[PDB]
């Protein structure tokens, strides 16, 4: 059941009715899971945390990408640390989806 993908998105571009379902969306002030039914589920992060993650992930390849990339190394860049941090947040929030 669990999502495998995420993307950054701007708030005025995020339309749950037409966005890809079962996917994580990182906005500049919120982190959400769009579940398989199209329900936006908040993932409990402060706007400040989200602003930091949103702005740390700058590589074009990583704007719309996979959640648990085995080749990410948080010790090599702030971007990869932020991607790994988001993955750990999502993993914890998805703990009981299966």
């Amino acid at each position: 059941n669990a999502p495998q993908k995420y993307q950054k998105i701007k708030r005025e571009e995020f339309n749950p009715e037409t966005a890809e379902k079962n996917k994580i969306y990182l906005l500049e002030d919120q982190l959400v899971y769009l579940d398989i039914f199209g329900k936006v589920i908040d993932l409990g992060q402060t706007s400040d945390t989200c602003h930091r993650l949103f702005n740390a992930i700058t590589t074009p390849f990583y704007q719309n990408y996979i959640l648990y990339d085995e080749y990410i190394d948080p010790e090599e860049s702030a971007e990869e640390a932020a991607m790994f941090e988001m993955g750990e947040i999502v993993k914890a929030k998805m703990k009981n989806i299966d």
Side-chain angles (χ1 to χ4, degrees):
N1 286 324
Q4 302 189 98
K5 306 160 155 181
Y6 75 90
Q7 76 169 85
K8 284 166 57 179
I9 196 157
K10 291 153 212 183
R11 172 77 57 177
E12 273 279 348
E13 293 291 359
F14 180 53
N15 182 349
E17 193 196 17
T18 58
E20 182 169 356
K21 265 50 89 167
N22 191 24
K23 185 170 185 185
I24 299 293
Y25 292 83
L26 170 64
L27 302 99
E28 207 168 23
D29 60 354
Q30 199 184 5
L31 179 68
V32 303
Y33 172 50
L34 184 54
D35 76 7
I36 196 59
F37 299 95
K39 181 69 59 172
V40 176
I41 297 162
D42 176 73
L43 294 188
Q45 303 308 300
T46 73
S47 61
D48 297 71
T49 295
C50 289
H51 185 101
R52 176 179 54 80
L53 296 175
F54 189 95
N55 286 284
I57 303 170
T58 51
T59 295
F61 295 129
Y62 294 159
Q63 304 303 291
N64 175 28
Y65 197 58
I66 48 161
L67 275 168
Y68 306 115
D69 182 355
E70 72 177 289
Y71 287 104
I72 287 309
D73 195 328
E75 306 298 339
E76 261 307 289
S77 69
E79 168 169 60
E80 288 176 61
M83 293 165 71
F84 183 84
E85 180 180 1
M86 171 175 64
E88 292 221 276
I89 290 165
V90 171
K91 190 75 196 266
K93 292 284 178 167
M94 300 297 135
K95 76 303 184 207
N96 291 311
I97 206 184
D98 287 304

